[PDB]
Amino acid sequence: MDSKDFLARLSLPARLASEQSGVPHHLILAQAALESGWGQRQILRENGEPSYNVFGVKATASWKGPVTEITTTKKVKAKFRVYSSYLEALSDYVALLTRNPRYAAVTTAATAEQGAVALQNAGYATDPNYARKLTSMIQQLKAMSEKVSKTYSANLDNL
Ligand SMILES: [Cl-]
């Protein structure tokens, strides 16, 4: 979807997931934007409802919840976790991060930029383009959130 719409949908759940886990707010958002293509990747349930699974987290035997089966083209079938909300999805994502001791420094970073350093040290992605893209995403999100905040107060002084 449009970047502004994506940010509007995911900002609050990422903030709440950040409070729960310690993972920086805009790091979660940046990874979600980056990996879903600002929501262009949609993973729907069989009846068309959203799965809210923005990261594309696969359903395996360690998942107790609902799943959705996506078949892509040779033909290939994959199972994804189904969530009831973006908040549940991002909460599950930072829990998965939290569960892995190698990413401890991510859960104690004070800024998104520090969090991105921590991910890179932990070896989150081997392709060095991922860290470059994440750095740029974090910068873009900072500018966007500034712009939103000014739309709010610029508007309020209508009245
Ligand atoms: Cl995918």
Residue numbers in the entry: -1 to 71, 79 to 164
Paper excerpt:
Members of GH family 73 (GH73) are β-N-acetylglucosaminidases that cleave the β-1,4 glycosidic linkage between the N-acetylglucosamine (GlcNAc) and N-acetylmuramic acid (MurNAc) residues of bacterial cell wall peptidoglycan (PG). In some instances, GH73 enzymes are associated with bacterial pathogenicity, for example, LytB being critical for pneumococcal nasal colonization and cell division, Auto for pathogenic listeriosis caused by Listeria monocytogenes, and FlgJ for biogenesis and function of the flagellum, which is a major virulence factor of motile pathogenic bacteria. The domain was found to adopt a lysozyme-like fold common to other GH73 enzymes, which consists of an α-helical subdomain packed against a β-lobe that forms an extended β-hairpin motif. The α-helical domain and β-hairpin of StFlgJGH(151–316) together form a groove-shaped active site, with the α-helical subdomain containing an α-central helix that houses a conserved glutamate general acid/base (E184), and the β-hairpin, in turn, containing a second glutamate residue (E223) previously determined to be required for GH activity.
To explore the structural basis of FlgJ activity, we determined the crystal structure of the FlgJ GH domain from S. typhimurium (StFlgJ) to 1.8 Å resolution. Interestingly, the active site of StFlgJGH(151–316) was found to be occupied by the C-terminal α-helix of a neighbouring symmetry mate. The C-terminal α-helix StFlgJGH(151–316) packs into the active site of the symmetry mate via hydrophobic and hydrogen-bonding interactions. Hydrophobic interactions were found to occur between L312 of the helix and F204 and Y249 of the active site of the symmetry mate, as well as between Y308 of the helix and L183 and Y286 of the symmetry mate active site. Hydrogen bonds occur between Y308 and N311 of the helix and K289 and backbone amide of Y280 of the symmetry mate active site. Residues 223–229—which form a loop connecting the two strands of the β-hairpin motif—were disordered and could not be modeled. Similar results have been reported for the crystal structures of other GH73 enzymes, indicating that the β-hairpin is likely mobile in this family of enzymes. A superposition of the StFlgJ and SpFlgJ GH domain structures with Auto reveals that the C- and N-termini of these enzymes are spatially conserved, which suggested that FlgJ might be auto-inhibited by the C-terminal α-helix, in similar fashion to the auto-inhibition of Auto by an N-terminal α-helix. To determine whether the C-terminus of StFlgJGH(151–316) autoinhibits the enzyme in solution, the full-length StFlgJ GH domain, StFlgJGH(151–316) and a C-terminal truncated form of the domain (StFlgJGH(151–301)) were tested for activity using a zymogram assay. Contrary to our hypothesis, we found the catalytic activity of StFlgJ to be unaffected by presence or absence of its C-terminal α-helix, suggesting the helix does not regulate function.
